[model samples]
Target: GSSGSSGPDLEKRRIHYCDYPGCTKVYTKSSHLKAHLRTHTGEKPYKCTWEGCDWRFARSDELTRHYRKHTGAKPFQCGVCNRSFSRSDHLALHMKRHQN
Candidate 1:
C-alpha cells in the first residue's frame, strides 16, 4: 500500500527554495518566497500611513514601528530600569546592558 516516495519526502515537494545570491531562505508558499526576494532587490512597497512622515519600509512590521515614532508610542519596556522603546528589538538590545 506504500508509494515509492513516502513520509517526509512528500512534504519537501511543496517547499519553495530561494536561489537568491548569498541567501539561503526557504518558504512553503510562492507568494511568501516572492515577497522575500524583495529583500535583495531593495523594494519597499510599504509606506508609512501616518501623515508628514517620509519613512518607507520593505516590510509592514517596519512601518508599524515607524508609525509608533509618529504616534509617540513606546510599548516595549525594560524590566530592569523601566526605560521604554518604540521597537521590541531596541528593548532587547537595552536588556543586554543589564547582564553581568
Candidate 2:
C-alpha cells in the first residue's frame, strides 16, 4: 500500500496476524500467533508423563486434561444421571443428548 502513510486505518489497529502461507488467522497477542505456529511446524512441546503412553500435545492444558484419563479422574459430572466426563465440553455434550 503506497496510498498513504498515516491514516485512520493505522491509528486503532494493533493486530498480531499469522504470516503462514495460506493462513488468514489473526490474533490480538503475539504469543497466540506463535502458539499457532506449532501447527505448521509440527511441534509438540507437551507429552504424556504416564507410563507406556505414547502421546504428544502442542499445549500443556491438553496434556493435563489427557493425563486424567489414565487416572480415571473425571471432574465434570452430570447432575441428572451422576455420570462423569473428562472434559467440560464433553459434559456439556452429554447434557445435550439427555435433553433430546
Collision pairs in model 1: none
**Candidate 1, residues 43-62: lDDT per residue as tens digits?**
78898876435667887877
lDDT of 2 by residue, 1-100 (tens): 6676663333444787788889998888666878898788878878887755678998888888888787885567798999766567878877987796
lDDT of every model, 2 decimals: 0.74, 0.77
Per-residue error for 24 in candidate 1, Å, reads: 27
Query: Which residue pairs in model 2 clash with each other?
Result: none
Cα TM-score per model: 0.31, 0.32
Give me the runs in candidate 1 sitting further than 4 Å from their true place: 1-40, 73-100
RMSD to truth, every model:
13.2, 11.0
Give the clash total for candidate 1: 0
Each model's number of backbone clashes? 0, 0
